[PDB]
Amino acid sequence: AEVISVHSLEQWTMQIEEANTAKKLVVIDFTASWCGPCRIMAPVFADLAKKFPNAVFLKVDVDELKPIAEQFSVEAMPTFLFMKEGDVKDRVVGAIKEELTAKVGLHAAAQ
């Protein structure tokens, strides 16, 4: 499985609605190109996506898709947001590899 980069509101809408229909966890990496910690977490996030094919891993550039960043009050990067069927389940703020890994394991399992 791969990380899906979302570059438009249309793409966001399509990914979220398809995930919601399939009732699967969505994990969103809110990122910025200039942000150092974001570069550090890119491989960690991509690795987790391969390890958890039942969940959808999305990448959102906060400068590219401002309404989506604003929707979730994202002003710190990287922010990893966990969402299932319209509800925010968790958030990880910063380059915390252990916390991100643990929370993906917690939320991606059968509920």
PDB file of C-alpha atoms in Angstrom, residues 1-3 41-53 57 100-101 104:
ATOM      1  CA  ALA A   1       0.000   0.000   0.000  1.00  0.00           C
ATOM      2  CA  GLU A   2       1.071   3.588  -0.729  1.00  0.00           C
ATOM      3  CA  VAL A   3       0.626   7.059   0.757  1.00  0.00           C
ATOM      4  CA  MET A  41       8.664  11.688   9.228  1.00  0.00           C
ATOM      5  CA  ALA A  42       8.026  11.047   5.514  1.00  0.00           C
ATOM      6  CA  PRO A  43       9.749   7.597   5.489  1.00  0.00           C
ATOM      7  CA  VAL A  44       8.158   6.664   8.854  1.00  0.00           C
ATOM      8  CA  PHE A  45       4.686   7.514   7.525  1.00  0.00           C
ATOM      9  CA  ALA A  46       5.276   5.674   4.219  1.00  0.00           C
ATOM     10  CA  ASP A  47       6.511   2.596   6.110  1.00  0.00           C
ATOM     11  CA  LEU A  48       3.353   2.537   8.272  1.00  0.00           C
ATOM     12  CA  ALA A  49       1.173   2.768   5.145  1.00  0.00           C
ATOM     13  CA  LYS A  50       2.752  -0.437   3.786  1.00  0.00           C
ATOM     14  CA  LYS A  51       2.313  -2.156   7.166  1.00  0.00           C
ATOM     15  CA  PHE A  52      -1.375  -1.225   7.463  1.00  0.00           C
ATOM     16  CA  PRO A  53      -3.102  -1.697   4.065  1.00  0.00           C
ATOM     17  CA  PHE A  57      -2.812   7.088   4.562  1.00  0.00           C
ATOM     18  CA  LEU A 100       2.688   7.790  15.715  1.00  0.00           C
ATOM     19  CA  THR A 101       3.539   4.082  15.397  1.00  0.00           C
ATOM     20  CA  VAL A 104      -1.629   3.630  14.146  1.00  0.00           C
TER      21      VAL A 104
END
